[PDB]
C-alpha cells in the first residue's frame, strides 16, 4: 500500500511523578489495541485517575490532554497490589476508547474520545521537533522521576519500619534530609540522601 | 513490573 491511516502521535497516560507512559506508539496503524497493567503508588489507595495524553514529551504536562476519568472502589491494599488493566483502542474511524479495570474488584470506568480531538498537522510537526530537541532533558527528567519515586517509597517503608534502639534519632534526621532532596531536581543528591539513610538504618 | 498511577 502507498497510503495508510496511522495515529500520528504516541498515546498514553500519566503515571506517578508526572510522567507520560505510552500505550500506543506514534505512527501505529489503526485500528489498533493495546493493554498494560498498572498498580498503585502507595498503601491504601482506593481511587486512581486515568489522564489520557497525546504527544512525545516525557513530562505529562508538555503533552496534549485528551481527557480523563476516575476509577474508585478499589479495595485499600499495599502498594503494587492492585492490578488496574488499562486498554487503549482506536477503531477504524479514529475514535479512541480508553478503559481501566481493577482486576480484583471488577470495577471498570471508560471514556470515548472523538477522532478530531488532539493536536493538528502543524501542532504535530512542532511536537516531534520539540521532542527531538529536548531528548536529552526529557530523559534526565524521566530518570529524576524514577529516582524520586524510589526515594519516596523508601521514605514510606522506613517510616512504617518504625522498641528500636535509642539511636533512631539520626534516622529521623536522615529522613528530613531525604524528604528535602526529593523536592529538588538533582538525581544524585537524592540517591546520596538515600545512601546516607541506608547507612544509619543498619540497626533496622 | 507495573508502573504506578498518580497517587491522591
Contacts with B, A 104-163, CB within 8 Å? 149
Residue (of A135, A138, A129, A124) closest to A26 by Cα position = A124
What are the structural domain ranges in chain A? Answer: 1-135, 136-204
C-alpha cell at A139: 530523559
Nearest CA in chain B to A146: B3
A47 touches B: beta carbon within 8 Å: yes
Provide CB contacts within 8 A for A166, sequence distance 6+.
Answer: none
The contacts of residue A112 (CB under 8 Å, 6+ apart) are: A95, A96, A97
Q: How far is B1 from chain A (nearest CA, A)?
A: 9
- For this PDB entry, the determination method is X-ray
Residues in chain B: 8
Residue A51 sits at the chain B interface (C-beta within 8 Å):
yes
CATH of A136-204, one of 3.20.20.60, 3.30.700.30, 3.40.1310.30, 1.20.1270.10: 1.20.1270.10
Q: With beta carbons less than 8 A apart as the criterion, state whether A135 and A142 touch.
A: no
Contacts 24+ apart (CB under 8 A), A7-11: A7/A32, A7/A90, A7/A94, A8/A124, A9/A54, A9/A55, A9/A56, A9/A64, A9/A118, A9/A119, A9/A124, A9/A127, A10/A54, A10/A55, A10/A56, A11/A52, A11/A53, A11/A54, A11/A66, A11/A88, A11/A90, A11/A96
Domain A1-135 has CATH 3.30.420.40: no
Measured torsion, CA atoms of residues A181, A183, A185, A189, in degrees rounded to the nearest 10: 10
Cβ-defined contact of A16 to B6 (cutoff 8 Å): yes
CB A52 within 8 A of CB A14: no
Cell of A65: 490532554
Best of B1, B5, B8 to disrupt the A interface (most A CBs within 10 Å) is B5
For residue B4, give the nearest of A16, A36, A83 by CB distance. Answer: A16
Phi, psi for A53 (deg, rounded to 5): -135, 145
A83 touches chain B (CB under 8 A): yes
Who's near A12: CB < 8 A, 6+ residues apart?
A20, A21, A22, A23, A24, A52, A53, A88
Closest CA to A46 of A130, A90, A88, A107: A107
* A199 closest CA partner among A183, A180, A182, A177: A177
What are the strands of the beta sheet with A96-102, ordered from one edge? A32-38, A84-90, A96-102, A108-113
Name the minimum distance, in Å, from the CA of A119 to any CA of chain B: 24
State the residue for C-alpha cell 486498554: A87
Q: Residue A150 gets which letter from DSSP?
A: H
Contact of A54 with A64, CB cutoff 8 Å? yes
Give the number of C-alpha atoms closer than 13 A to the C-alpha of residue A96, restricted to the C-beta side.
Answer: 26
Q: Report CA dihedral (A72, A77, A82, A84) to the nearest 10 degrees.
A: 10
Which chain B residue lies closest to A12 (C-alpha atoms)? Answer: B5
Closest CA to A23 of A93, A113, A107: A113
Q: How far apart are the first and last CA of chain B?
A: 21
- A25 burial level (CB within 10 Å; 0-12, 13-18, 19+): middle
Cα–Cα distance, A60 to A78 (Å, whole number): 26
Beta-carbon contacts of A93 under 8 Å, excluding residues fewer than 6 positions away, are A115
Amino acid at each position: 500500500v502507498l497510503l495508510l491511516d496511522v495515529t500520528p502521535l504516541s498515546l498514553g497516560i500519566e503515571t506517578m511523578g508526572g510522567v507520560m507512559t505510552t500505550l500506543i506508539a506514534k505512527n501505529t496503524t489503526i485500528p489498533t489495541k493495546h493493554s498494560q497493567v498498572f498498580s498503585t503508588a502507595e498503601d491504601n489507595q482506593s481511587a486512581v485517575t486515568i489522564h489520557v495524553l497525546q504527544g512525545e514529551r516525557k513530562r505529562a504536562a508538555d503533552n496534549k490532554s485528551l481527557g480523563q476519568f476516575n476509577l474508585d472502589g478499589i479495595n485499600p491494599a499495599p502498594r503494587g497490589m492492585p492490578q488496574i488493566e488499562v486498554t487503549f483502542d482506536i477503531d477504524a474511524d479514529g475514535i479512541l476508547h480508553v478503559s481501566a479495570k481493577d482486576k480484583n474488584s471488577g470495577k471498570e470506568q471508560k471514556i470515548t474520545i472523538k477522532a478530531s480531538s488532539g493536536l493538528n498537522e502543524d501542532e504535530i510537526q512542532k511536537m516531534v521537533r520539540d521532542a527531538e530537541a529536548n531528548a536529552e532533558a526529557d530523559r534526565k527528567f524521566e530518570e529524576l522521576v524514577q529516582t524520586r519515586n524510589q526515594g519516596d517509597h523508601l521514605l514510606h517503608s522506613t517510616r512504617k519500619q518504625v522498641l528500636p534502639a535509642d539511636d533512631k534519632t539520626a534516622i529521623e534526621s536522615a529522613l528530613t534530609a531525604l524528604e528535602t532532596a526529593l523536592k529538588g531536581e538533582d538525581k544524585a543528591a537524592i540517591e546520596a540522601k538515600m545512601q546516607e539513610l541506608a547507612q544509619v538504618s543498619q540497626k533496622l | 513490573k507495573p508502573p504506578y498511577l498518580p497517587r491522591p
